[PDB]
Paper text:
AMPA glutamate receptors (AMPARs), the primary mediators of excitatory neurotransmission in the brain, are either GluA2 subunit-containing and thus Ca2+-impermeable, or GluA2-lacking and Ca2+-permeable. These cation channels assemble in various combinations from four core subunits, GluA1–4, with each contributing unique gating kinetics, trafficking and subsynaptic localization. The ion channel is encircled by diverse auxiliary subunits, modulating receptor gating kinetics, pharmacology and ion flux, with the transmembrane AMPAR regulatory proteins (TARPs γ2, γ3, γ4, γ5, γ7, γ8) being the most abundant.
A GluA2 mutant (F231A) increasing NTD dynamics phenocopies this behaviour, and exhibits reduced synaptic responses, reflecting the anchoring function of the AMPAR NTD at the synapse. The role of B/D NTD interface stability in this transformation is supported by a desensitized (R/G-edited) GluA2(F231A) structure. The NTD dimers of the mutant receptor also transit into parallel O-shape conformations, and the LBDs depart from two-fold symmetry, which again is coupled to an increase of non-domain-swapped receptors (relative to the resting-state receptor). Rotations are larger for one of the two LBD dimers (C/B versus A/D), and movement of the B/D subunits is less pronounced than in GluA1, perhaps due to subunit-selective contacts between the NTD and LBD tiers. Transition into non-swapped LBD dimers probably involves relaxation of the critical M3 gating linkers of the B/D subunits, as observed in an NTD-deleted NMDAR structure, thereby entering non-conducting (‘deeply desensitized’) conformations.
Numbering used by the authors:
A (entry chain C): 570 to 626, 633 to 716
B (entry chain C): 423 to 506, 511 to 520
C (entry chain G): 5 to 42, 55 to 84, 92 to 162, 173 to 210
D (entry chain C): 766 to 773, 785 to 823
E (entry chain B): 521 to 551, 569 to 618
Write the structure that this text describes.
């Protein structure tokens, strides 16, 4: 009959849809068993149906302010730096503060330096720079 | 390069002769309000280490206050650059 | 029948130990188009040395570099150090000693159970080893006679374990009788 | 100088490795529990 | 499913069967209808999601059975999906 150990086994077996060795014989036991059977059907069917998708498997300035794990810099004395230093827009002023306060100095000393620092930071360092250089780089290995 | 070609036509249009020189500081440029020093291309031109810059140098407010730029030959904009597997227990993801 | 069982278990233990040892030793685990000592060319890779075949310098063998998330690092470590295949070989060795010591100290009839546990555990270790090896490799190809030697070692080891437990059960049945 | 530089289903064991790891680990826990009970019973024998 | 998954499914079937047999019949203090042949049948049936006709009653046997059940659920659900 169902002691605590046998009852845990009955329930586990029902959830894994792996059949039983005993089943409740009384009215109360059968009510409990019925609801557990229904729960198992809905949940297992849903697991299998969604396992029909999980089957094998940041891009704004706002997104950049959102991501604090990424540290992002500009040329140390560069028109990007000067535009951040003398900025009047809120986003760029926040970026200028982050550059001035993201320690150590996120600033690099050459554009290719910032590129390679990003290309050698596994996405933990980002570069703020002119759009032409990015277009050339994204177009070139 | 692109600016080396442009400088060739810059010299053609100006008629003058040019010597292509790089910036040692390797920076487009900016100024330290405390040292009153200019860096990179602007530092070179503000200090006379050169006389002209047909290069990817950028016009901006701070540098214009201390040196003379030309008419912008191309526009640009700031932008962001970033670095471009099933779990062991992926079977719990559904 | 009986008496033959001890011989069969002994033979099996030696065979499994030898097969697994050879497998860990040799290098024909994977036939892939990789790079020999440092183009592309078929390379019999093993647990430790990837070696070149059908090449301008075939026969040049190089130690595989198992490193270019923490899980990736831990798997790379567990695969670089073939801890699971090696543990399999060590366990098989300890099992062999237990089977051999059975002839002596025969009154204990409790060391043979130890032999069985060692053999079965060796099998489980072999399985984990195959899983990690394949997973790591995944991050056209084929498997060589070394890989299948490892598999046969697992099958024989499990059979030898079953026989050991069977004879332990018989010994206690006789003792209780 | 920008465009002319242009240079840019089966299920694998890696997907279901976790379930294999759990299976073997469980087999181990089971063998351990069994041996512990066996040792306890061996010592339990009224000497 | 890939060739490797099938190979390791077979290896695991053998392993689960051997461990269930060992864990159920090794203790002399137990002397369970779980000999090696019955163990192999229990495992095969569990994998094919069919009936059992026997279920481990001991704690250790139940641990083995539970993990084999979970493994079967994930692998067969994945085969069907």
């Amino acid at each position: 009959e169902f002691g605590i150990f046998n009852s845990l086994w009955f329930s586990l077996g029902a959830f894994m849809r792996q059949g039983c060795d005993i089943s409740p014989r009384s009215l109360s036991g059968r009510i409990v068993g019925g609801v557990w059977w229904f729960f198992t059907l809905i949940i297992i069917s849903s697991y299998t149906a969604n396992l029909a998708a999980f089957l094998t498997v940041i891009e704004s300035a706002e997104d950049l302010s959102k991501q604090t794990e990424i540290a992002y810099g500009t040329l140390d004395s560069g028109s990007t730096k000067e535009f951040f230093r003398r900025s009047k827009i809120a986003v760029f002023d926040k970026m200028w503060t982050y550059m001035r306060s993201a320690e150590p100095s996120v600033f690099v000393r050459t554009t290719a330096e910032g590129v390679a620092r990003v290309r050698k930071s596994k996405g933990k360092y980002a570069y703020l720079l002119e759009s032409t250089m990015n277009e050339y780089i994204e177009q070139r290995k | 390069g692109y600016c080396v070609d442009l400088a060739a036509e810059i010299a053609k249009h100006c008629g003058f002769k040019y010597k292509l020189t790089i910036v040692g500081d390797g920076k487009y440029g900016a100024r330290d309000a405390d040292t009153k020093i200019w860096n990179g291309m602007v530092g070179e031109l503000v200090y006379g280490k050169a006389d002209i810059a047909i290069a990817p140098l950028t016009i901006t407010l701070v540098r214009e206050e201390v040196i003379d730029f030309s008419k912008p030959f191309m526009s640009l904009g700031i932008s962001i650059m970033i670095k471009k597997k099933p779990g062991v227990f992926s079977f719990l993801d559904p | 029948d009986r008496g033959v069982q001890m011989l069969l278990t002994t033979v099996g233990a030696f065979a499994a130990f030898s097969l697994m040892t050879i497998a860990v030793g040799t290098d024909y685990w994977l036939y892939s188009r990789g790079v020999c000592k440092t183009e592309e060319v078929m390379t019999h890779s093993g647990l430790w040395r990837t070696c070149c075949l059908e090449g301008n310098f075939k026969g040049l063998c190089k130690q595989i570099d198992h490193f270019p998330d923490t899980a990736e690092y831990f798997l790379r470590a567990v695969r670089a150090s073939s801890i699971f295949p090696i543990l399999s070989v060590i366990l098989l060795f300890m099992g062999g000693l237990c089977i051999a010591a059975s002839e002596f100290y025969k009154t204990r009839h409790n060391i043979i159970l130890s032999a069985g546990i060692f053999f079965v555990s060796a099998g489980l270790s072999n399985i984990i080893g195959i899983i990690v090896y394949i997973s790591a490799n995944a991050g056209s190809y084929s498997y060589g006679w070394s890989f299948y030697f490892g598999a046969l070692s697992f099958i024989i080891a499990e059979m030898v374990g079953v026989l050991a437990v069977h004879m332990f059960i018989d010994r206690h049945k006789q003792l209780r009788a | 100088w920008w465009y002319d530089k242009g240079e840019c289903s089966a299920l694998s064991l890696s997907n279901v490795a976790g379930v294999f790891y759990i299976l073997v680990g469980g087999l181990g826990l089971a063998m351990l529990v069994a041996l512990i009970e066996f040792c306890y019973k061996s010592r339990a024998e009224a000497k | 499913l890939a060739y490797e998954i099938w190979m390791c499914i077979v290896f695991a079937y053998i392993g689960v069967s051997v461990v269930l047999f060992l864990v159920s019949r090794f203790s002399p203090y137990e002397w369970n209808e779980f000999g090696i042949f019955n163990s192999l049948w229990f495992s095969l049936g569990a994998f094919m999601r069919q009936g059992c006709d026997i279920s481990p009653r001991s704690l250790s046997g139940r641990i083995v059975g539970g993990v084999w059940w979970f493994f079967t659920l994930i692998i067969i659900s994945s085969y069907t999906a």
